[PDB]
């Protein structure tokens, strides 16, 4: 389970950028660093923990895409 978490991180940062997270320089820098560290991950649990960290900044943010309906 390595390519799947990598494409998941790709689409996750795609969504994050789509939600204008790039308007917060610090938060966007954090997201970019986590994405680039996932795309160079050569192990699965580190990729998974960086992935849940990167998903945090998506589901901690409110006014974003809803989650109770999905």
């Amino acid at each position: 389970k390595m390519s799947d978490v990598k494409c998941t991180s790709v689409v996750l940062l795609s969504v994050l950028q789509q939600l204008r997270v790039e308007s917060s320089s610090k938060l966007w820098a954090q997201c970019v660093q986590l994405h680039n560290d996932i795309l160079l991950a050569k192990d699965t649990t580190e990729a998974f923990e960086k992935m849940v960290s990167l998903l945090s900044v998506l589901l901690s943010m409110q006014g974003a895409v809803d989650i109770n309906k999905l």
Partner: protein, 43 residues
């Protein structure tokens, strides 16, 4: 543009990891965090 998040969550459920599924199950009913998870939860 709303289908991007739907397919993202499809891929996320395809991953089926304990941490990710736990976080999504929590955030389902509002129990979300506030800051980035370190390597501030409410309700």
């Amino acid at each position: 543009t709303s289908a991007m998040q739907t397919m993202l969550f499809t891929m996320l459920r395809k991953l089926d990891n304990d941490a990710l599924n736990n976080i999504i199950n929590n955030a389902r009913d509002g129990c979300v965090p506030l800051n980035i998870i370190p390597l501030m939860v409410v309700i």
